[PDB]
Scaffold this active site. Structure first.
Site, PDB file in Angstrom:
ATOM      1  N   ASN C  81       0.851  -1.202   0.000  1.00  9.43           N
ATOM      2  CA  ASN C  81       0.000   0.000   0.000  1.00  9.43           C
ATOM      3  C   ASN C  81       0.886   1.251   0.000  1.00  9.43           C
ATOM      4  OD1 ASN C  81      -1.892  -2.027   0.450  1.00  9.43           O
ATOM      5  ND2 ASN C  81      -2.560  -1.223   2.461  1.00  9.43           N
ATOM      6  N   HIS C  82       0.425   2.327  -0.622  1.00  6.80           N
ATOM      7  CA  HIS C  82       1.108   3.601  -0.472  1.00  6.80           C
ATOM      8  C   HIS C  82       0.221   4.514   0.362  1.00  6.80           C
ATOM      9  CE1 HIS C  82       4.190   3.623  -4.007  1.00  6.80           C
ATOM     10  NE2 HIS C  82       3.895   2.366  -3.696  1.00  6.80           N
ATOM     11  N   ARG C  83       0.837   5.482   1.032  1.00  6.36           N
ATOM     12  CA  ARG C  83       0.101   6.611   1.572  1.00  6.36           C
ATOM     13  C   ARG C  83      -0.634   7.366   0.476  1.00  6.36           C
ATOM     14  NH1 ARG C  83       2.263  11.610   5.394  1.00  6.36           N
ATOM     15  NH2 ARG C  83       0.225  12.677   5.386  1.00  6.36           N
ATOM     16  N   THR C  88       1.196   9.880  -3.605  1.00  2.26           N
ATOM     17  CA  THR C  88       1.553   8.483  -3.359  1.00  2.26           C
ATOM     18  C   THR C  88       3.079   8.274  -3.436  1.00  2.26           C
ATOM     19  OG1 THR C  88       1.270   7.998  -5.729  1.00  2.26           O
ATOM     20  CG2 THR C  88      -0.648   7.662  -4.317  1.00  2.26           C
TER      21      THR C  88
END
Lengths: 202, 203, 203
Positions: C81-83, C88
């Protein structure tokens, strides 16, 4: 005039293979002349036909003048699980469970796989069991084909859906009427530019 | 601050992660933005992931800045296209007399350039098909097969990929598209990364 | 009667068929049921097929009993997952000062645990994305990319995977979910495999 259909590597690009001479050894496979596979990493196209077991009696047929891109796989019926109850294959593990082997009549039989003539199957397509793809179809790269595709349709996706007819219905019917792929080769050879622009129909 | 964007392998002790620009530098008809990275699947460099890109067809690949590209992503340029106004069978490939049937450039499908914007995240094993545009700030889900364009700051996924939702409200997107933080010198970005990361940069 | 569920290779001399529980027992935040198996693609062990699963993210993977997992299946946990409340772009990964912008655990998407039920068949080359639940008795078609939940005893397929049909009428499904044969004592299972295989176990 043109290449020798009985050569496994007809272009003196060893990626490009004629599939007929490769697959002729294979039981329950019928493949047309000039249909080719563009190998992904050097594998021969016979390695791309999976779970094809003579005992299940399902057939694969591929027509003539097909274009098959790298990494295409054809899934025959041999990976089907029994499905009228648990899909867990007890039989596989022995230790007394081998008595629970399914009868042939308890395995799903999804049918034969029949790919017509003049069909282009894109890179990394998967063709699942029992599918029929009509003459002149195009299947987009990375499609997963679970249902039949009609003639001269463009289809794509996972699962693969028909996107549109390539040509007008009338042209399609005329092409299906004349079946240029079944002409003598010396006649094909006289008419390739017209096969390439559809002016064969008249 | 931050790594030099011209360093091919900018992360000490993680050689999977490549800055794409210094690698793609040798390629004709490819333009790629600073800081955009590829996270290699098995050590392959990202040039291996750009397929069917033939100078004679004159299609371009452009990728913006600050993109995150996951392992196994492939970009398909126009070289896989078949002629389509009649039979797709490429007689010409086989020679032995058939080469007289080579298609002229203007008989082949020309699907267009592939333009990936700035600050885009492309997930693992995505396939980008010819001619697509992906807008700034978009996110493409893992395993997508992108056939149509994707608009700025859209989440898209699937095979074929469809737009799932806008990431932010339109007003926010409009502001981000106006400010274009990715075009600022890195010594200005450096002062603002926290606000870029939480979107308060529009304030 | 039946195989030893603690053997990683329950069939002597066969390294293709693997019991998953004994292989994954060493793993934090994974729970796997007896007799569930993997059919290896090239001889890789199933632990290789669990991706982005990082203890620090505290997401759990659970697989029930009597599952069939086809070759090449991957399970994607939360670690890719990315922030995404802003950019991103993972500045922090590149250090040289940017490691100060590391996201806190509670700034990352938490998509939840992945829970695969009992007597589930996951076909060849499926991808299971983060936070998905798959109910007992489900069948997931080969090449599916599973992004949302799948209910018990449903056939599902596609990318993204959708429910296609119920396998059995609801009354049959309700009875099977009531009796939970997979939780019976093995001696009882053994006496009844033929009924389990034809669903006459409910009658």
């Amino acid at each position: 005039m043109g290449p020798n259909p009985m050569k496994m590597y007809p272009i003196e690009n060893k990626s490009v293979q004629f599939i007929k001479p490769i697959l002729e050894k294979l039981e329950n496979v019928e493949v047309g002349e000039y249909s080719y596979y563009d190998s992904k990493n050097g594998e021969t196209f016979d390695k791309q036909i999976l779970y094809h077991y003579p005992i299940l009696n399902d057939k694969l047929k591929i027509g003539k003048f097909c274009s098959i891109g790298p990494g295409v796989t054809i899934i025959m019926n041999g990976a089907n699980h029994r499905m009228d109850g648990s899909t867990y294959p007890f039989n596989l593990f022995g230790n007394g469970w081998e008595k629970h082997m399914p009868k042939l009549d308890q395995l799903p039989i999804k049918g034969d796989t029949i790919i017509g003539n003049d069909v282009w199957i894109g890179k990394d397509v998967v063709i699942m069991p029992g599918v029929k793809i009509g003459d002149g179809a195009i299947v987009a790269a990375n499609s997963v084909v679970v249902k039949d595709i009609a003639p001269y349709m463009l289809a794509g996706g996972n699962p693969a859906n028909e996107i549109k007819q390539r040509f007008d219905q009338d042209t399609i019917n005329q092409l299906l009427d004349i079946k240029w792929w079944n002409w003598p080769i010396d006649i094909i050879n006289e008419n390739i530019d017209k096969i390439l622009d559809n002016s064969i129909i008249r």
